[PDB]
Amino acid sequence: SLVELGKMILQETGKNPAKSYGAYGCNCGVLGRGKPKDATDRCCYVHKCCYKKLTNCDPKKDRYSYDWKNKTIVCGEENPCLKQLCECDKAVAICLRENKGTYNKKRDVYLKPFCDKGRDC
Amino acid sequence: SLVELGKMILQETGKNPAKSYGAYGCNCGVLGRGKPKDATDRCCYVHKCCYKKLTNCDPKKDRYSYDWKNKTIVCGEENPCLKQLCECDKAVAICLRENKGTYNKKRDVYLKPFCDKGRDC
Structure with missing residues (x-):
């Protein structure tokens, strides 16, 4: 979750x-x-x-376990859904930390933000 | 602190x-x-x-600044006693995390762990 x-x-x-x-x-x-x-x-x-x-x-509603280990997000190994869900969240938070370089709070969302269509996954 | x-x-x-x-x-x-x-x-x-x-x-009471950059405590600079303090604190935090593999609950201080005199620092 x-x-x-x-x-x-x-x-x-x-x-x-x-x-x-x-x-x-x-x-x-x-x-x-x-x-x-x-x-x-x-x-x-x-x-x-x-x-x-x-x-x-359920990516948003399902809980899984991870450890904080060596200051690293280690996914509790388990369901291909949960494991990979955890991995998706590990990945996001890494990525987010990797890009604090350019966090522009100007992008925080006052109502609508004007977003273009997501390109295809 | x-x-x-x-x-x-x-x-x-x-x-x-x-x-x-x-x-x-x-x-x-x-x-x-x-x-x-x-x-x-x-x-x-x-x-x-x-x-x-x-x-x-005052190690117990004196506030210092540090940042969590790149999942690293970065002591900010303040004073030399306060930067040193922060380094001592950071050292202990890290040593703590590097040794939790060998953490034992027996040292709860339910025991009050049978303490011998510490060799001089």
């Missing part, structure tokens, strides 16, 4: 997930996909595509 | 520092150094010994 997602993004970025990513760009926090506004947005685009792949489990 | 220490320890071990380290061994979260029981205890031994040097500043 977004309990582990939220925790991982904090774990990786140090930034609160809801406050920095709740409505960021076209993809972070908000529903659905848009064309990324920026690399951070892009991470979430990559994340929602990654969740799209996931059909036998 | 321990507020920072606690957060660092938490961000390093992702383990609650009061619950996990609050009374652990001869050196963690208790007053005084003792012969280190195990590695965690030894971390806190070396933590205390690192503090012993910081006499220009």
